[PDB]
Every structure is written in C-alpha cells, then in structure tokens.
C-alpha cells in the first residue's frame with residue numbers, strides 16, 4: 001500500500017519518492033552542450049524521485065530538432081557530467097533519455113544535408129520538425145521523406161546507442177532510458193504503419209521488436225539491465241505513426257523485457273487502453289511500472305492503489321513546479337505552466353518558476 | 364576513484380552523494396514528539412547523501428536529556444512518520460539513531476525517579492546530563508551513580524531496541540543506526556573502564572561485545588542487516604569512559620559485523636588512531652565505512668582517495684548549512700555555526716541558517 005512518498009527500489013536504484021520528472025525537451029542548448037543553466041534547472045528539480053532527462057540525440061543523424069543536446073562528443077559528455085554532478089549534490093538521481101528521431105527529421109537539420117533514415121521510406125504525414133534555415137532563423141518545418149535503412153546499417157545504429165550509454169555511464173548518470181515512444185525511431189520499427197520491411201527487422205511481431213531489443217541489450221551491457229529503462233507508447237498515434245497490433249506488441253515486449261530483468265517500463269498514455277491492459281502489464285512485467293499523462297496527486301495515488309503502477313511521471317507540472325513532490329505532500333496549489341516558453345530561449349520560463357515559501361527557508 | 368558527488372550503495376540503499384549529515388541532538392521536542400518544526404529542519408537538509416537523525420531515546424529509562432525525542436510511543440512514532448514523509452518529499456533518506464544513555468543520566472530525568480542503569484555501578488566522573496528541576500527550570504546537572512543491570516534485565520533492553528526499530532520501520536525510516544558510541548550504554552558495555560561484569564556480558568572481548576551484538580541482531584531482524592548501521596568511537600574518552608583494549612575490540616567488532624553483512628560502520632573520530640588502523644578497518648569490514656570529526660571537503664576527499672572511507676559525515680557544518688553538499692560542489696563559503704543555539708529553543712539557530720542564492724531560485 002505505497003503512497004507517493006514511499007521509497008521505491010527501481011531496478012538497483014533506490015528512489016525516495018514516486019513522483020518522477022518526465023523527459024521534457026526544452027531546446028535550451030544551442031550548441032548541443034549542456035551547461036550551467038541546465039545545472040540550475042535540473043538541480044532545482046532534484047527532489048524528484050527520479051529525473052528522466054530531456055530526449056538526447058545519440059548521433060548527428062539522430063537529430064530532428066535544433067538546439068537540443070547530444071551525447072556523441074567529448075564536449076557534450078563534459079557538459080552532461082557537470083549537470084549530473086549538480087543533480088547529485090542536490091540529492092537527486094538522473095536518467096539519460098537516448099533519442100533518435102528516425103523519419104521525424106529533414107535534410108536541413110541532418111549533417112551535410114543527408115536524407116533522414118527510418119525502417120521504411122514513408123514520410124510522416126503532417127509532421128513538423130524544428131529546423132534552422134540558411135538565414136539563421138528557426139522554426140517548425142515539414143519533415144521530409146526518409147530512406148529505408150539497409151539491413152547492414154542497423155548494427156551501426158545499435159552501436160550509436162551503445163556508445164551513447166558508455167558516455168552516459170562515464171558522465172555519472174544513474175540510469176538510461178531508451179526512447180522507444182512518441183513515434184521516434186525505435187517506435188517506427190515497432191509499429192505496423194511505419195515498418196514495411198521484409199528483412200528480419202519487419203513483418204512479424206518478433207521481427208519488428210528485433211532492433212529495439214538489440215538497442216536495449218546493447219545499453220544494458222553498459223549499465224546492467226537493473227539500471228535501464230524503456231519508454232513505450234502503445235496505442236498512441238503521433239507524427240503520422242499508426243499500428244494495427246499495439247496490444248500484442250506491448251505484451252510481447254513486456255515478456256521479453258521481463259526475461260531481461262529490466263528496471264522499468266515507462267508508458268506515456270494515449271490519454272484508450274482496453275480494460276484489463278494495465279492488469280496484464282503488471283502480471284507480465286515484474287519490474288518497475290511507470291505511467292505518465294495528465295496525472296495529478298489523486299490520479300497517481302489511484303494507480304498505486306490499484307497495483308497497476310509503481311510510480312508516476314509528471315511533465316508539464318514539473319516544468320512549472322521545481323518542488324512538485326513537496327506540493328503534493330502539502331496539497332499546495334501549483335504554478336501554472338507557460339507553454340510559450342516550453343521551448344527555446346534561456347532562463348525565463350525555465351529556472352524562474354518559484355518554489356514554495358515555507359516561511360523558514362532563506363536565500 | 365569516487366568523489367563527494369559520486370553515488371554510493373550503502374547496504375541496499377542508494378545514496379546520491381557521500382556528504383552525510385551526522386546525528387545531531389538539538390533538543391527541540393519538549394514533549395518528545397517530533398513535529399512540523401522538525402519536518403522543516405530535516406527537509407531543509409534532505410540533499411544530504413543520508414541524514415542520520417538526532418539520537419532518539421528507545422524508552423523512558425534510556426533518557427538522560429530532557430526535550431529530546433523518543434521512539435517508544437504511538438504519538439512519537441506518528442511525529443517521526445511526518446518528519447520522514449517530509450524528508451522523502453524533498454528527495455532524502457533518513458536513518459533513526461537509537462539511543463540509550465546508560466549511566467549518563469540522573470533520577471530527576473528517569474521515570475518515577477528510578478536509578479539510572481549501566482553494565483556496572485560506576486558513576487561517570489565529571490559527567491553532566493540535562494535535567495528539568497522540580498521548579499520547571501532546566502540545566503546541566505551532574506550524573507548520578509547507576510545500578511548494574513541484572514543479567515536477566517539485559518534481554519528487556521535488547522527488546523526495547525527491537526521495538527524501537529519496529530516503530531522506526533513503520534514510520535518509514537530508510538535505515539537505523541545503533542548508537543554504540545560517545546560513551547552511551549552499548550559503549551559502556553564495550554569499554555573495559557565501564558564494564559566490570561563477571562557474567563557472560565563482561566570480562567573478555569567476546570563477553571563485552573555480547574550485548575551490543577544482540578542489539579545489532581535484533582534491529583537487523585527488523586530492517587535487514589543491509590539497512591542497519593552502527594556508530595562506534597574506539598579510542599574516544601567521553602563521559603568518564605576509559606578503555607584498555609580499543610583497537611582489539613574494534614577489530615573483533617569489524618569481523619563480527621562483516622559476517623553479519625551490516626550496511627555500515629560509522630566512526631566518530633577521537634580527533635589518535637595507530638598507523639594502519641584505517642587500513643585494517645577497510646580490510647576487515649567490507650561494507651560501508653563512514654568517518655566523522657572536523658571534516659571539510661578536502662579532508663573528506665582525502666579519505667576517499669586513500670580508500671579508507673566510502674563517505675564522510677559532517678555535524679556542525681550541517682547545523683549551519685542546509686545545503687552543505689552544494690556548497691562543497693561550488694567551493695562556496697559556509698555559514699558559521701552558532702553554538703549558543705545548538706540546543707533548545709525553537710526556529711532560531713535551527714531553520715534560519717540560509718541556503719545559497721544561485722540567482723535563479725525564487726521563494
């Protein structure tokens with residue numbers, strides 16, 4: 001009968017509470033290298049049971065959005081090391097979310113104007129990515145038509161994830177989270193709409209799951225499976241992605257990741273799920289289960305109560321409330337998020353959302 | 364090659380950094396029940412890798428100092444539960460330090476004016492405890508002559524420690540720390556000067572260690588040895604205690620507590636130790652080693668570097684600096700402690716030591 005402030009063993013990592021900071025792209029690293037401003041922002045939020053970083057590009061060709069951080073260079077690694085140290089000195093734990101956008105990209109953001117890559121050569125209908133144009137302005141821009149990866153290019157991407165994890169581990173991260181959600185590259189492989197391959201990486205459920213599971217295995221070699229998680233979005237349609245077998249894929253992956261002893265599965269809610277889905281997930285996967293999507297303290301506690309989650313992630317409320325878990329403890333009113341400063345810029349709408357004033361703390 | 368901000372597995376508990384808050388009696392619970400003021404104070408310090416609570420009386424006859432908290436009633440337990448929740452919501456971990464003063468007491472602070480108890484009927488020469496007099500005033504007062512515990516009263520004290528741990532575990536503490544240091548009851552058994560018993564609880568090293576090891580075993584039944592620690596002060600003379608065999612007892616206990624798989628040993632420094640002592644300790648005990656006594660960041664890092672400690676506790680600097688680990692990260696100047704408000708009173712000199720102002724945080 002855990003509550004939001006009951007400690008949780010998430011794989012081999014002890015969390016102090018179950019109020020998790022969801023991964024949140026904020027697009028505040030114009031040179032791709034985290035710095036002091038990120039030290040501040042993440043440090044402010046270090047009371048989170050776990051911080052899951054902003055999505056972090058694992059290579060140049062992984063990128064779809066300018067001004068987002070990377071984890072393929074020495075300088076990027078050094079920047080994250082500083083951020084991690086900052087989180088640790090404030091009593092926190094942080095996981096790096098490992099990102100490759102696949103088809104959700106454009107030549108203009110690719111290195112040397114390379115074509116985006118994907119399981120299959122299908123443009124994401126209606127999707128926009130965020131590009132810097134030749135004149136130095138930036139903006140949302142329709143994604144372009146990707147090329148289908150060659151079978152022999154797939155190992156190289158797995159290795160890009162592996163090296164990202166190696167860098168993450170050296171930088172001091174407590175965990176990594178494989179981003180297989182929100183219609184990014186691993187999700188593109190998982191989903192029937194986006195994966196029309198006829199090699200060993202498409203067709204059947206096992207084939208579609210093959211590359212994502214290679215990624216999980218590679219990163220788990222680095223961190224241990226007990227310090228790896230994965231984000232999944234069964235039933236979510238985003239960036240043109242559709243899927244005829246979301247439930248069956250979810251159950252297959254649950255069983256495969258359970259065998260591997262993964263620390264957690266993290267579901268971002270389409271919010272629907274069929275009745276019984278959450279119950280099945282809890283039976284099929286014996287590690288940590290984290291759910292995200294419009295939660296507040298009451299709704300989160302209900303999933304603890306139903307034995308369908310071990311913890312709950314919060315996105316927009318952690319943007320706006322660096323001390324979200326304390327606010328939930330006291331039932332204190334939350335700061336309102338300002339969507340106009342979710343992305344880009346600097347400290348405004350990033351590190352200037354206030355903490356509670358308990359009448360004793362002094363700065 | 365860990366640094367102060369390198370995570371540590373301390374038994375089965377993950378710590379975010381190695382800057383530990385030492386146990387600090389503050390004498391701010393006149394009714395023995397922790398409350399909101401303690402929620403604030405401990406919450407302020409929750410960035411500590413681990414908070415080790417103020418020494419907490421395990422029963423009425425355990426007490427030598429008025430206005431200190433207890434852990435033998437429902438109401439005390441409820442008060443600590445609130446404190447623990449506060450620490451968890453701020454991202455912390457907290458261990459309860461389990462206290463029985465033995466001979467360092469007086470009839471005036473004992474229930475119903477009972478005589479203090481000890482391994483042997485030896486008054487602590489020069490020692491003072493802190494008493495409330497009949498007229499309602501309070502002050503330091505010379506300790507009285509204890510009675511030697513009967514052999515058949517020793518199990519009852521072990522059970523008092525066990526029940527304290529049961530309460531602690533229900534209240535949500537992450538760990539307990541057996542106080543066997545600073546010349547309190549278990550140390551009185553350990554030391555040759557204070558223990559002149561001729562039953563199975565005195566004489567030889569094994570006999571003197573017998574009661575303390577029963578205490579460790581009882582509390583470890585509750586928490587698991589992986590969530591128990593013990594504080595020791597070999598070579599320290601306090602409250603009239605002397606010892607002819609400090610090194611030999613330390614090595615015996617090291618080996619016995621290693622076999623038991625205890626989470627950590629915590630040494631409060633007489634600071635001397637013989638050359639080779641720390642090295643021997645590291646060989647003889649394979650769990651966590653924590654040292655305390657006048658450390659700063661440089662001196663602490665040196666013990667990490669020498670492979671003689673896994674973490675270091677700080678006392679007076681955590682009184683004065685709620686964000687001590689962050690100050691060490693930045694090399695920021697520390698607030699100066701005010702000894703005049705270490706004990707007694709209320710918020711002044713307790714929750715009004717300021718945090719750093721990073722120029723971004725707002726209250």
Ligand SMILES: NC(=O)[C@H]1C=CCN([C@@H]2O[C@H](COP(=O)(O)OP(=O)(O)OC[C@H]3O[C@@H](n4cnc5c(N)ncnc54)[C@H](O)[C@@H]3O)[C@@H](O)[C@H]2O)C1
Nearest residue numbers: 025027055065066067068129130181182184238343344345
């Ligand atoms: N990495 C990810 O998986 C996610 C990135 C953030 C948004 N994520 C999900 O996508 C959809 C659409 O989110 P939203 O409506 O908030 O995004 P926008 O279309 O406005 O912006 C998309 C991206 O465009 C970039 N962007 C957009 N505006 C800016 C500005 N002004 N500066 C810098 N960068 C900007 C930035 O990378 C944003 O993440 C929603 O379901 C979110 O939960 C997913």
Ligand SMILES: NC(=O)[C@H]1C=CCN([C@@H]2O[C@H](COP(=O)(O)OP(=O)(O)OC[C@H]3O[C@@H](n4cnc5c(N)ncnc54)[C@H](O)[C@@H]3O)[C@@H](O)[C@H]2O)C1
Nearest residue numbers: 388390418428429430431492493544545547601706707708
């Ligand atoms: N529980 C413990 O093991 C410790 C309690 C705190 C002090 N501890 C060690 O004892 C010695 C002497 O410490 P100090 O000089 O700081 O203590 P005092 O003699 O002034 O006070 C002793 C106790 O007396 C009580 N005291 C003393 N003054 C007050 C006031 N004004 N209000 C309430 N209570 C008071 C309170 O419990 C104090 O802990 C030193 O080596 C410390 O590291 C040990």
Ligand SMILES: Cc1cc2nc3c(=O)[nH]c(=O)nc-3n(C[C@H](O)[C@H](O)[C@H](O)COP(=O)(O)O)c2cc1C
Nearest residue numbers: 022023024025054055268292293294314315316342
């Ligand atoms: C500003 C913004 C940025 C986000 N960036 C990411 C991201 O980097 N990776 C990811 O997996 N999801 C990302 N998301 C989705 C969030 O992690 C989260 O799942 C979503 O906002 C729903 O939770 P909420 O209702 O509590 O905000 C983002 C959402 C927003 C609002």
Ligand SMILES: Cc1cc2nc3c(=O)[nH]c(=O)nc-3n(C[C@H](O)[C@H](O)[C@H](O)COP(=O)(O)O)c2cc1C
Nearest residue numbers: 385386387388417418631655656657677678679705
């Ligand atoms: C105000 C005060 C209260 C203390 N209370 C305790 C206590 O409850 N239990 C304990 O084991 N030691 C206690 N000590 C000792 C500290 O834990 C610590 O070992 C000592 O202060 C030396 O470390 P420092 O030099 O970093 O302050 C206390 C010390 C002071 C200054």
